[PDB]
């Protein structure tokens, strides 16, 4: 089954270099080209470059002086490397598989989940997680004072999915992000079931589980 998954450093300081790997599964790089596409916060998709099945590359005009794409067919990995990072370069970076056609693809059938690069001189900080305490009952977790984006939040290790709202983060005046995740549940179950929010902040390697009680 076809998968693509991007891996990168999360946070890079301005002027320095960025390396992202895209690991691919269920097809061979010797047979398919792969595009790199970026999305800056709140903006549109931008095509960054392509490495074709035979290994030749083409690049975005605006970035090409600072950009290289390469790959390792045997390892099913495609690498993007960019020098002299600017604040501008802050984006979610995606790799995408070609589909159809011979020299020119018909489309990009499969995309990775993306990886969030923040270009900043600040340092990583893991989040503080505080409970938002309870026919219908709302409960939540306040995920405060972390940097950079992103944080993922789940409930009961993913068993609870319906009625979950994880709000977009807000950037505070301290330069740190905060958000809250809420879940809506039956009040009757506030005595029988435990509710834990699982919070993951990859850039700080921080994982927090918080039990939320009345």
């Amino acid at each position: 089954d076809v998968q693509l998954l991007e891996s990168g450093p999360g946070l890079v300081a301005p002027s320095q270099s960025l390396s992202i790997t895209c690991t691919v599964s269920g097809f061979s790089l010797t047979n398919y080209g792969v595009d790199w596409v970026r999305q800056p916060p709140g903006k549109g998709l931008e095509w960054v470059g392509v490495i074709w099945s035979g290994g030749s590359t083409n690049y975005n005009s605006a970035l090409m002086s600072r950009l290289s794409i390469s790959k390792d067919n045997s390892k099913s990995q495609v690498f993007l490397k960019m020098n002299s990072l600017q604040t501008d370069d802050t984006a979610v970076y995606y790799c995408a598989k070609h589909w159809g056609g011979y020299y020119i693809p018909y489309g990009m059938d499969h995309w990775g989940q993306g990886t969030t690069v923040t270009v900043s001189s600040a340092s990583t900080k893991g989040p503080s997680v505080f409970p938002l305490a309870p026919g219908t009952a709302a409960l939540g977790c306040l995920v405060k004072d972390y940097f950079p984006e992103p944080v993922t939040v789940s409930w009961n290790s993913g068993a609870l999915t319906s009625g979950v709202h994880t709000f977009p983060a807000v950037l505070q005046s301290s330069g740190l992000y905060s958000l809250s995740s809420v879940v809506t549940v039956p009040s009757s179950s506030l005595g029988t079931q435990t509710y834990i929010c699982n919070v993951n902040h990859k850039p700080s390697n921080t994982k927090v589980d918080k039990k939320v009680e009345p």
Binding site: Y94, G112, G114, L132, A138
Partner: protein, 216 residues
């Protein structure tokens, strides 16, 4: 450098109506091999983009018959009949006839549905947070439509300003609703100064404002 012009930028459409998105190229995107490599992608909230249409008019596998692409040369249209809640997101056209390939600017599709009043909840700061020196009081507006909503903080009936932040989700893929959080942030000291914390909410689905409060 071929430019793709996508309009409109945002497209509110009622459930079950037709949406029509336009993509114009700065030059012909008919390749010299006779193909025209125009694609339409949909990026749903919290998702990677997904391929809908390739080669102007061909539906990708799994793409419902409601989506149709047409056009030629420099002028292209995506049409979605009977718009559904799941069609919500940002549509991009993309051109691969010319090097370098280029995306259009995107079209945000917003679903217009019937009015839904929010449910309102208020949450006191946790004791943990207070013992680290700050008080966050959260007001939650859950599952409403339309997006526009008024949230006012009052502390001992004093109307608050400058000390709160609001976050709103993207529209929901199943019921086309929004939710909103309003966070009132205070020093532990200032918080323990007052008794009544009230979140006051105005919305079109409500016949009057709804206040949710607690006493510290």
């Amino acid at each position: 450098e071929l430019v793709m012009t996508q309009t409109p930028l945002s497209l509110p459409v009622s459930l079950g109506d037709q949406a029509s998105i336009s993509c114009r190229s700065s030059q012909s995107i008919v390749h010299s091999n006779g193909n025209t490599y125009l694609q339409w992608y949909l990026q749903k909230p919290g998702q990677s983009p997904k391929l809908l249409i390739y080669k102007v008019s061909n539906r990708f596998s799994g793409v419902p018959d409601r989506f149709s692409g047409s056009g030629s040369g420099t002028d292209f249209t995506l049409k979605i009949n009977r718009v559904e809640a799941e069609d919500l997101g940002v549509y991009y056209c993309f051109q691969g006839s010319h090097l370098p390939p280029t995306f259009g600017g995107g079209t945000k599709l917003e679903i217009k549905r019937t009015v839904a009043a929010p449910s309102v909840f208020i949450f006191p700061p946790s004791d943990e947070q207070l013992k680290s020196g700050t008080a966050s009081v959260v007001c939650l507006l859950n599952n409403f439509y339309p997006r526009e909503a008024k949230v006012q903080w009052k502390v001992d009936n004093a109307l608050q300003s400058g000390n709160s932040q609001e976050s709103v989700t993207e529209q929901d893929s199943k019921d086309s609703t929004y939710s909103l959080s309003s966070t009132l942030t205070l020093s532990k000291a200032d918080y323990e100064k007052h008794k009544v914390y009230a979140c006051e909410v105005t919305h079109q689905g409500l016949s009057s404002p709804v206040t949710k409060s607690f006493n510290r």
